[PDB]
């Protein structure tokens, strides 16, 4: 139905040599994927709804001039977004970075009722509003 001289190719993609990443950056660097935990200073939620990948932090020395934050690894302030973790891990393997996986932690739904603020015998009765 889509005849274009199709060929079964079982082994996974090795686009590594195509990407141009240097050997030690494609080998030594370890990237982890995760859902970023929300800033506890905020109650907003729509920042833990994506799968972001980031790389291990490297040396950060202070230059002699003003004590700036000169670094050497270019892939330090590089974070990639992904809808589902499967896409992220596929990208990681096909690129060739050693990857680490953390499962999407989500808040457990707790039973909440205002009638618990008052009680006849339960300890849950509040003492101030």
């Amino acid at each position: 139905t889509q005849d274009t001289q199709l060929i079964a190719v079982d082994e996974k993609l090795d686009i590594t040599t195509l990407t141009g990443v240097p050997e030690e950056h494609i080998k030594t660097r370890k990237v982890r994927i995760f859902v970023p935990a929300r800033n506890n200073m905020q109650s907003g939620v729509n920042n833990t709804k994506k799968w972001k990948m980031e790389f291990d932090t490297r040396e950060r020395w202070e230059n002699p001039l003003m004590g700036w934050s000169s670094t050497a690894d270019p892939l330090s302030n590089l974070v990639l977004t992904f809808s589902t973790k499967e896409d992220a891990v596929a990208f990681a393997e096909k690129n060739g970075w050693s990857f680490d996986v953390e499962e999407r932690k989500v808040p457990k739904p707790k039973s909440k009722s205002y009638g618990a603020n008052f009680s006849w015998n339960k300890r849950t009765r509040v003492s101030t509003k």
Binding site: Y114, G115, N117, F118, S119, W120, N121, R125, S127, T128, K129
Partner: protein
């Protein structure tokens, strides 16, 4: 058929026979009037019977509520879960113009305690928590010596009137706040916590004081209950009109010759009420500039509507206001309506418990901007901003104090916008 006019309530038909302190307010005079008559039979007849006659009489909320007493008291007919069912009676009366509860309680407390006994028998309540505004010290002292006399006579307490219903009354002081008149704020105040209202649901029915099933009531609401129970719902249903039936203890004050509080049949036009009882507004009917109906919470009404409208909840609703607690306050021509509403909303700002944002912030904002209005420092645009702020306050507050403070502003704007405009024009002209 339908009673053509309402007014001149029969003197023997007035429920509060000692409203003016003309009779012995202790047990002897109360029983001479007819208090504590047929109680035994009333408890024996049952909560279902009492609830039937409270529906037949058809009392809308006497404490400025309007909800029928029938279903409100039927909310306490479900089988007891084990928690101690209680009855609560509210007696704050901090509302500008409210003086009837204080008068009845210092003059007819035995009728009140008989309302609590009969009502609580209907309610399935263990006892009554009769809460008294702390400023009314001698009034509480009188009601409780009356209560002690009733206890000595055995009418209230164990086996009340020889019926086995173990009802009781607890006299509760309050360190003073109009917000304590709100039913859930009352629950909170009597719970030893702050007088901040709680959000419903949980309604006061299932969850009340200490979490037990309770139900609030006005002093007048329960005080009229025993007499109408002894007589039957026909007496209350006869007076007044449909829905709004019976009698209400009207309070009259302001710029009237005789600022009195009198009992009168229900749904009576104001034109008769102010002139015949209060000696007319000082300066004649012409001098009357405005009248605020029951409670300052209800918006003020110009004289163009008061002379025709009856004093009944639905008609005042048609009059763009509410019936409230029949605290008719009259302001004459010499009265500065703007400054009067200024002091009124200043009282509201002083009484806000500050729980929810709309009340706590908007009432203060209104106080400042409207005091500027009273002085005259404003642009004609700010009237619309004040109206929109009044709308914002309405409906977004935990309790109804927000609504009761927003409504007077709405009435003032709607009925006296040009007076505001000329005031601010004069303010613009005087300074150059």
């Amino acid at each position: 058929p339908k009673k053509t006019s309402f007014g001149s309530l029969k003197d023997e038909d007035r429920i509060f026979t000692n409203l003016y302190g003309r009779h012995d307010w202790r047990l002897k005079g109360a029983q001479s009037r007819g208090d504590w008559y047929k109680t035994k039979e009333i408890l024996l007849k049952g909560p279902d019977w009492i609830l039937g006659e409270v529906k037949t009489s058809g009392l809308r909320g006497r404490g400025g509520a309007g909800f029928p007493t029938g279903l409100k008291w039927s909310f306490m007919n479900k089988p007891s879960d084990g928690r101690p069912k209680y009855l609560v009676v509210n007696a704050d009366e901090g509302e500008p113009g409210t003086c009837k509860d204080r008068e009845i309680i210092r003059h007819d407390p035995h009728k009140l305690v008989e309302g609590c006994l009969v009502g609580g028998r209907a309610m399935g309540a263990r006892a009554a928590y009769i809460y008294i505004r702390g400023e009314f010290y001698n009034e509480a002292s009188n009601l409780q010596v009356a209560i002690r006399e009733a206890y000595e006579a055995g009418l209230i307490g164990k086996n009340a009137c020889g019926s086995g219903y173990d009802f009781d009354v607890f006299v509760v002081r309050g360190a003073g706040a109009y917000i304590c008149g709100e039913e859930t704020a009352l629950i909170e105040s009597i719970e030893g916590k702050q007088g901040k209202p709680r959000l419903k649901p949980p309604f006061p029915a299932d969850v009340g004081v200490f979490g037990c099933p309770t139900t609030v009531a006005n002093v007048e609401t329960v005080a009229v209950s025993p007499t109408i129970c002894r007589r039957g719902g026909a007496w209350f249903a006869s007076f007044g009109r449909e829905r709004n039936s019976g009698t209400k203890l009207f309070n009259i004050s302001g710029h009237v010759n005789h600022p009195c509080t009198v009992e009168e049949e229900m749904s009576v036009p104001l034109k008769e009420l102010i002139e015949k009882h209060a000696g007319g507004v000082i300066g004649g009917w012409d001098n009357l500039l405005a009248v605020i109906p029951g409670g300052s919470s209800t918006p003020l009404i110009p004289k163009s509507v008061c002379e025709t409208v009856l004093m009944d909840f639905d008609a005042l609703v048609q009059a763009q206001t509410g019936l409230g607690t029949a605290a008719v306050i009259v302001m004459d021509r010499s009265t500065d309506i703007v400054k009067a509403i200024a002091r009124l909303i200043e009282f509201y700002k002083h009484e806000s418990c500050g729980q929810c944002t709309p009340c706590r912030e908007g009432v203060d904002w209104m106080n400042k901007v409207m005091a500027r209005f009273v002085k005259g420092d404003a642009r004609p645009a700010e009237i619309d901003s004040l109206w929109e702020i009044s709308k914002q306050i309405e409906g977004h507050t935990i309790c109804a104090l927000g609504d009761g403070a927003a409504w007077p502003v709405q009435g003032l704007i709607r009925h006296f916008r040009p007076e505001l405009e000329e005031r601010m024009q004069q303010f613009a002209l005087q300074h150059q």
